Amino acid sequence: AYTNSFTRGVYYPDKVFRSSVLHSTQDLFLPFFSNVTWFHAIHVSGTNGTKRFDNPVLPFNDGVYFASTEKSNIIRGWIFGTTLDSKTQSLLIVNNATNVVIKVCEFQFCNDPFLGVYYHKNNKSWMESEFRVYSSANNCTFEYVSQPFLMDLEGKQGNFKNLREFVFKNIDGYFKIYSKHTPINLVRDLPQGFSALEPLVDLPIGINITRFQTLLALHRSYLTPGDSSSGWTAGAAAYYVGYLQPRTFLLKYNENGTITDAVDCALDPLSETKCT
């Protein structure tokens, strides 16, 4: 499935503050009105149907625009690296429901890594359970841990309440991450609207990463038996992936220093004039 990412994918090119100015820059951005691949989730049980739990590996290319909508925090994290063989260092960003953890280590990943949570009937609480991202870790260059907040453990489907936009690109060894969180009321596709992605982290990994893959989580309620047979729920969530390309953009800085709008001068003849 394909959707159109109308305006989205714009993040601040740099730290520099500007005001009431139009600053042109060339950086890797998602093109406007680009075509985005749509991935869908509802893990398939033994029975088959519309159900799909898509955890494919995707190309890193120029960098990846990642967007996800979540009813119930299905998507735990991502993997970045060439092989993911445990041959070399790779990036593992996962939220183990308790904290965000980042590890560079040479992890061994399973064929189909995923998370699962299980809920016991005796106690009414959703806790994580099955976790099979990595067998073992090799040497580790860097490790990071983050806040204690919790994530949505159950497979609850409904209008997508939240939107989390991320841009991953590694330039010069630096793995840059940008993000933005907003509430949304829309199941089908990305909302049409413009918003920036402020940079959260800059990691010095300096590893060459060819490809990446997303990680999802399972959600089990009390009713379910713990087993891996068919007691698990992937949830409603879906995510989108686009690819950045070197383009020129005109960024409009407001008085605040926040960017209200942008023009993709590559897009249309009207746009081309705007940059000039």
Epitope: T47, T50, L186
Partner: antibody, heavy 126, light 108 residues
């Protein structure tokens, strides 16, 4: 042949409870989303809830959230809309309705309601 | 969310005459729109889905067209049976929404 019948209904006081069943026949029940819809007397149509084929994903209108629970028994061929805690505004008729097409298909007609029951009336009053 | 606004809210026409009720989407629906016919107490019957498709058992007098955000349900030759309220609905995105409804009346 193809028939869907609502059930339950009846009056109960506010903060009351009702379990509207909906029996379906004439089609492969497990493959179609089902939908409750209400029409207060004098008012226009308002969609209540929907449930996906697998029975996992369920959606509700805001007014209803927490109050009503849409259940399903593909084996049973029944709809179950559990209602608590009833309000006056809740008075209306409830129709269970078929989606069109297969829930499986990418081209999804499921939102289109091709078949409807007669309805059931729920009256909430002292 | 999206709001569907039908117009006119009510109309009166003679038997054979052609009637056109329009529905306007606040947001671009694409063609995820359906039309339903409802009689006073009775439950609604689906007239059209996918904007153009007629559903089985409906007369050709009923037709539906649409492009962009605006859609139209036309009834080529009004019949007395046709008395009812007609509603448009958009299945495009959640929540599903119905228009206000247009009451049709037989001019006499």
């Amino acid at each position: 042949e193809v028939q869907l019948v609502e059930s339950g209904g009846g009056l109960v006081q506010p903060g009351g409870s009702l379990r509207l069943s909906c029996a379906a026949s004439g089609f492969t029940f497990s493959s179609y989303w089902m939908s409750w819809v209400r029409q207060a007397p004098g008012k226009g149509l308002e969609w209540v809830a929907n449930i996906n084929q697998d029975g996992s994903e369920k959606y509700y209108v805001d007014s209803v959230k927490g109050r009503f629970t849409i259940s399903r028994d593909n084996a049973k061929n029944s709809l179950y809309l559990q209602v608590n805690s009833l309000r006056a505004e809740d008075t209306a008729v409830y129709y269970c309705a078929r989606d069109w097409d297969y829930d499986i298909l990418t081209g999804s007609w499921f939102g289109a309601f091709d078949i409807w029951g007669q309805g059931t009336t729920v009256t909430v009053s002292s | 969310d999206i709001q569907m606004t039908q117009s006119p809210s009510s109309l009166s026409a003679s038997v054979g005459d052609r009637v056109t009720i329009t529905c306007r989407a606040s947001q671009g629906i694409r063609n995820d729109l359906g039309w339903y016919q409802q009689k006073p107490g009775k439950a609604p019957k689906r007239l059209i889905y996918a904007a153009s498709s007629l559903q089985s058992g409906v007369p050709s007098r009923f037709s539906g067209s649409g492009s962009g955000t605006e859609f139209t349900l036309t009834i080529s030759s009004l019949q007395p049976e046709d008395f009812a309220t007609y509603y448009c609905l958009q299945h495009n995105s959640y929540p599903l929404t119905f228009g206000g409804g247009t009451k049709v009346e037989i001019k006499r």
